[PDB]
Amino acid sequence: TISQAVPPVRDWPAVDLPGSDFDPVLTELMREGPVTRISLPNGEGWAWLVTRHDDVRLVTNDPRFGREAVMDRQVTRLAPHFRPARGAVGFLDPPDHTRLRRSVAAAFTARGVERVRERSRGMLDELVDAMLRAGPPADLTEAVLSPFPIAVICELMGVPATDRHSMHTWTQLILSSSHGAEVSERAKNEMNAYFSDLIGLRSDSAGEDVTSLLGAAVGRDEITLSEAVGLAVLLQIGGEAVTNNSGQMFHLLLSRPELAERLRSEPEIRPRAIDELLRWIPHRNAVGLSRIALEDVEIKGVRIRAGDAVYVSYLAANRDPEVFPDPDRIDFERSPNPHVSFGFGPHYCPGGMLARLESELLVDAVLDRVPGLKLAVAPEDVPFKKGALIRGPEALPVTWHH
Ligand code: HEM
Description:
The chain has 16 helices and eleven strands. By secondary structure, the chain is an alpha+beta fold. The protein has one domain (1-402): CATH 1.10.630.10. The chain has a six-stranded mixed beta sheet, sandwiched between helices. A hairpin with a 7-residue loop joins strand 2 and strand 3. It is globular. Bound molecules: protoporphyrin IX containing FE. The PDB classes it as oxidoreductase. Keywords: CYP158A2, oxidoreductase. It forms a monomeric assembly.
């Protein structure tokens, strides 16, 4: 009937945001309408953006949107660099995506990750023992939040004990140290070779650790060795997400003492509280990886054309006022909490249950074992990551009673 003009293309420059402050450009986009168009610093052209919870679920779960097609051009994006390997799980669609996710799914369910909870709680107690022994102050990130997710994933992956410190080092060197280009990709090569060998060796394993599952799937020709190794590396270095996210968690718990006080007074609410924190924390800068409309799709009266790129903002979806009344309020009692901090659809985060487990153990040890714990700097003086994809502290200086 009546033409509905397309939205203006909104430029979305890379900006370093303080602490956990919400992106005001994303707020602007949320206020503009459910369907907007954006231009990011890198790649070319524009992309659709959806911000409402229902539209985000549609775009991420509907078969009419595809990931492989994203590598057919230079879609506008935040990251300077793009498309490493084209076997990367992120860029696969259900001809092949499903095989790869299925091969390890069992280790990452609630029941799957529960298998490493006691060992993980022990490893965390070791780290905290050491921090207490050294005495205050400490950088909680360096002392605890950084090493713990790596220890846990080593255990879940089934890395032989004598190789786990090599794993730590490799993980630290990969894309997150200094010595750009060279040491990172050499560490990546070593880790690749390592997992190629371990998974290869486990070609007929009935083990239930992740590398055994990968090895067995490779052995039954469900996936190739190359696919298995790539995924193994992604999973192995994925814990940095928990390091960053839990860093924001404790930054919040310490800068807003009432939250910490609630979790000490009512320990029973900690799982729900963690979910609320996961909902609220602005985990990333801007948006991540788009999907291509494989056929024309109408969203809120807007015609998304086949070939167009479409982004979702999980961050925005987690502040959807209809789904989350008073969305900017951190409410640990929040009634239903259907957040999409771990994404949605086939590409939903494999590590979500693992991240909740890690966060629950972390909150327990840090809130229960550090007497008089507080920030050692003003909240606004905690350094947060600049030029980042995933937001979070560079360091989290804390102090307490020795
Ligand atoms: C609280 C911490 C974490 C958060 C907030 C998080 C969030 C996310 C999000 C938003 C996505 C994208 C979903 C999409 O493409 O639509 C994702 C993907 C992914 N995450 Fe995480 N993640 C976390 C921890 C982890 C950990 C610890 C691991 C490693 C076990 C991991 C492994 C992955 C993988 C492999 C993918 C790609 C999945 C696929 O495309 O099939 N994540 N994550």
